[PDB]
C-alpha cells in the first residue's frame, strides 16, 4: 500500500495473509467471507508467466494479523487449505480477466475481536455503492512504493496498511491504460486534478476493497486488488476484480462444496 497509514487494531478483521511455507514469503492478501472460506485473486495461486502454480499444501492462511512479520501468538490464527478453486474462465493472459479464487479451509476458524468475515454485496448494495467518486478502502502488507532502484528506506511495512480511494468512472479507467479492461474489473484512485495520493502495490493482490453501507451498517467487499502499472503514478489507477459481477460463481462453489 502506497501513501496509506497503519491500520488500527481490529479495523479489518476479515484481512487474511496468504503465507508461503517454504521459503517463508508473503504471497498475497485475501479476505475471510465465512468461517471456512477465503477469497483472493486467482493470480496469487496461478500465474504461468511467472512460473507460479501453487498447490494447497504449499501455503497457509493467517487470519487476525496486524504485524507483517511477527507470529502473533494467541492473536492470529493459522489455517490450512483443504482446496483451491480458481474461476474456470480466469484469463491470466492477457489482462487477468476474472482474477478471482476461493480457498476452503480444512477446519472452521473461530471468530474473535481480530477475526470476522466481511459481507459480499447483493445487487442493490452493488448499485448503491459502486459509483464514481464513492470511496472504498484497501488493505495490505505489500510494497510501500513502486519498486525502483532509486528508492531509499524500507520497502515493506511493519504492520497492515490501509488507504481509502475513490471509485473512477469506467471511461476514465479505460483511457488511462493500454491494457484491455473488462466489466469484471473496476478502477479506483485519485485523478490528476485531485492532487492526492494512495494506491495498492505489488504484494497487496488478493486483498479486499471494501465499502461501508449506510443502509445497514455493514462492510461489503466490492473488489479484490488485481493489477496496476507501477504504483501511485500520475494519471494511473489501480484495478480491482469486480466481486459482484463474479458472485454467481462464488455462490456456485460454496453451494456445491
Amino acid at each position: 500500500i502506497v501513501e496509506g497509514s497503519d491500520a488500527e487494531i481490529g479495523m479489518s478483521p476479515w484481512q487474511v495473509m496468504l503465507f508461503r511455507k517454504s521459503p517463508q514469503e508473503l504471497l498475497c492478501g485475501a479476505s475471510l467471507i465465512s468461517d471456512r472460506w477465503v477469497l483472493t485473486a486467482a493470480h496469487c495461486l496461478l500465474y504461468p508467466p511467472w512460473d507460479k502454480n501453487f498447490t494447497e499444501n504449499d501455503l497457509l492462511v493467517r487470519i487476525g494479523k496486524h504485524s507483517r512479520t511477527r507470529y502473533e501468538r494467541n492473536i492470529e490464527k493459522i489455517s490450512m487449505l483443504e482446496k483451491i478453486y480458481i474461476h474456470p474462465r480466469y484469463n491470466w493472459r492477457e489482462n487477468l480477466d476474472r482474477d478471482i479464487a476461493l480457498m476452503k479451509l480444512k477446519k472452521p476458524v473461530a471468530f474473535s475481536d481480530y477475526i470476522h468475515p466481511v459481507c459480499l454485496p447483493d445487487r442493490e448494495t452493488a448499485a448503491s455503492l459502486l459509483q464514481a467518486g464513492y470511496k472504498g478502502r484497501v488493505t495490505g502488507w505489500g510494497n510501500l512504493k513502486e519498486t525502483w532502484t532509486a528508492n531509499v528506506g524500507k520497502g515493506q511495512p511493519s504492520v497492515l496498511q490501509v488507504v481509502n480511494l475513490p471509485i473512477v468512472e469506467r471511461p476514465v479507467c479505460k483511457d488511462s491504460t493500454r491494457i484491455r479492461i473488462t466489466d469484471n474489473m473496476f478502477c479506483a484512485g485519485y485523478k490528476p486534478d485531485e492532487g492526492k495520493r494512495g494506491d495498492a502495490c505489488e504484494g497487496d493482490s488478493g486483498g479486499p476493497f471494501v465499502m461501508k453501507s449506510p443502509f445497514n451498517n455493514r462492510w461489503y467487499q466490492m473488489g479484490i486488488v488485481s493489477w496496476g502499472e507501477g504504483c501511485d503514478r500520475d494519471g494511473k489507477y489501480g484495478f480491482y476484480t469486480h466481486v459482484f459481477r463474479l458472485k454467481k460463481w462464488i455462490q456456485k462453489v460454496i453451494d456445491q462444496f
Binding site: 497509514s5 488500527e8 472504498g136 461501508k212 449506510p214
Partner: peptide, 27 residues
C-alpha cells in the same frame, strides 16, 4: 454470514475508526 461486516471493535461497540467518516462523506 448473518453477522458479516460488523466489526467487534467498531460497529459492535458503536466506535468509529479514524478514517471511516471519510468514506461516508463521499457517498
Amino acid at each position: 454470514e448473518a453477522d458479516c461486516g460488523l466489526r467487534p471493535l467498531f460497529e459492535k461497540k458503536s466506535l468509529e475508526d479514524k478514517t471511516e467518516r471519510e468514506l461516508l462523506e463521499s457517498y
